[PDB]
Design a protein around this nucleic acid. Sequence first.
DNA 1: ATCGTCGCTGTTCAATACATGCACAGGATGTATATATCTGACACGTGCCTGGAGACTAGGGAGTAATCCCCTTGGCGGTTAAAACGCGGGGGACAG
Length: 49
Amino acid sequence: NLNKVVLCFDRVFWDPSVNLFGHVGSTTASRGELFLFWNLYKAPILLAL
DNA sequence: ATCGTCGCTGTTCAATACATGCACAGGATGTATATATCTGACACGTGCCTGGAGACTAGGGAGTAATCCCCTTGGCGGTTAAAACGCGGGGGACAG
């Protein structure tokens, strides 16, 4: 089981040259909670994991 | 213009393959050993005789004491060459 969270924005507000950046969790039980987003489509969209 | 993306490259980092130093099984060649076997050289027994043993003598070689003096030890001192100590360095030893 895994899931994805789509975030459609109206303007670029990250680093365009970076396709993905990680976010560590505070605890071990929630390590797989929103740990990585993605950028690789035309529209400014982030894909949470 | 203005931003993003797509063709063209280098530079570094990591992964892999090769080369070099080291130990440990593996065989084969010789040595040691196990065994069977047959031999002739050693040990003994016998028989025979020459060299060792016994008994005696005579005689001189050696042991023994008594005397001699030569040779060896010993102490002393005086110049004196030889031994001893030290220095410096060179060539001979010894290892790679």
